[model samples]
Target: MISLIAALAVDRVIGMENAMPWNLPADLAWFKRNTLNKPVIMGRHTWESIGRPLPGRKNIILSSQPGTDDRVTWVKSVDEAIAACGDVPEIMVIGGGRVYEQFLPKAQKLYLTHIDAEVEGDTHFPDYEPDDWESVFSEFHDADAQNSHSYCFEILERR
Candidate 1:
């Protein structure tokens, strides 16, 4: 299965300065829990943004000029990345903006966190039709003194 995973703000903004605009520990940990032990593919920009290979998962970087690493594998295309995965149950398409757009149509599932705030970001998440996806799961969380923003974790499967 192919899954696209991302968190976006109210304006659909994804990142600022090649990093998450908000540092929500709960959200990050949630991402870790969901993507662990899976083959994770990300664009070159996203990998550069992240700075290193994520431990406990296979890091597959998609780039024309890919880098070399023992901890990660690089591919020139999405198909190449999937082939590199070697029959995994699922491959997580972690993203920035362009990568999400490229893989959105091929995605069977999406794990999204919707933040209820308008943050400053140069990169925005790709648009998708609600009618094309069915929400399989959803959980609302209220921001307290600890959490920075109110958000909802939602899982959607393509209809």
Candidate 2:
């Protein structure tokens, strides 16, 4: 099944430019540990942000338009993103807005890092009501416990 995974800031602002504005080494470790060797998907912008395919994971990028990319397969639709997963049962969408909003409903699980701080930004998360989901799991982390920032890790599913 497809699962969307993101480490986001408090305002749900992923980036001001094309990259993550903050860094938390511990969160990086957590992300690597969970997503390694799994199929991961992203939007064109997010793919640009990364600039290359990560080793050990099959990468997919959703783009309505394309230029030329060989390291990762690009699909035009979310269904195609899920189908392109091949034999992999757990595919994760690592995104920018365009990819996440499209995949959110079909996703079986959400790995979210809800930060305690906010910042100035133009981007925002999708407007999905909490009534649509159930908090299946959560872990609250303070600044002292986490590396660069304080945040809560929540895993949610459709109720």
Candidate 3:
């Protein structure tokens, strides 16, 4: 299965100045729980923003330039990334806008965290048709001391 995971603001902003606009540990924990042990595909910018390979998972970075680090595999295209995943049960497309856009159509499922606020952002999540997906799971979370904004965790499967 090909799944796309993202946390975006109400206005669909995913990043500001190459970093996430909010600090939500709850969402981070949610992300780690779902992505761990799965093959994650991301763009070069996302890899740079993360600073290092995520532990307990195979990291596949999509980059035009060759990478020297043996800790992760670098591929030049989406096809290469998919191939590198090597028959995994689920392929997680983690992003930096462009990578998400490229995989959105091919994605069979989406794990989305929708933040309640709208913030200024340089990068945005791609527009997707709601009618094409059916929500299989959803839970709302209120903001707490650790999370600044109320958010909802939703899983949608393509119809």
Candidate 4:
């Protein structure tokens, strides 16, 4: 199975100046909980934004150039990344916009966190037809001191 995971605003804005616009520890924790112990594929820019390989998951980065770190595997293309995963039960496609767009069609499941506020950003999640997916799980979270905006966690399985 392949899954795409993202946290975006209602406008589908995901980043501002190459980094996430909000600091929501709750969402961060949610991301970790879902992706832990899985193989994650992402673009080179996403890896750069993260600064280092995620601790508990196999980090597979798509890059045109060679990588020096042994902690992560760098592939030239999506196909290479998929090949490197080698029969994992599920592979998580983490994003930087373009990567998300490329993998969205192939994803069987989606783990989405919809932030309530709309913010300005150059990066946006790709548009998808709602009719193509069925929600398997959903929960609303109120804004608190740690989170700036109310958010909804939703799991969608391709129909």
Assess the local accuracy of residue 149 in candidate 4 as a C-alpha lDDT between 0 and 100.
Answer: 91
Assess every candidate by TM-score: 0.96, 0.90, 0.97, 0.97
Q: Where is model 4 more than 4 Å wrong at Cα?
A: none
lDDT string for model 1 (1-159, tens) is 899999989788999888886778789988999999998999988988888889999999998984766578989987898899898888899997999999999999999999888888899988899899999999999998767899899999999
lDDT of each: 0.89, 0.80, 0.94, 0.92
C-alpha positional error of residue 20 in candidate 4 after TM-score superposition, expressed in Å = 0.6
Q: Over the full model, what C-alpha lDDT does candidate 3 score relative to the true structure?
A: 0.94
Candidate 3 error regions (>4 Å) = none
Off by over 4 Å in 2: none
Best by lDDT: 3
The residue pairs that clash in candidate 2, if any, are none
Q: Model 4 — TM-score against the truth? A: 0.97
Clashes of 2: 0
lDDT of 4 by residue, 47-132 (tens): 88999889989999998899878789989988889999999899999997999999998999999999998789999999999999
User: How far in Å is the alpha carbon of 104 misplaced in model 2?
Assistant: 1.0
Model 3 Cα lDDT, one tens digit per residue, 35-136: 999999999899989999999999999999989688999999888999999988999999989999999999999999999987999999999999999999
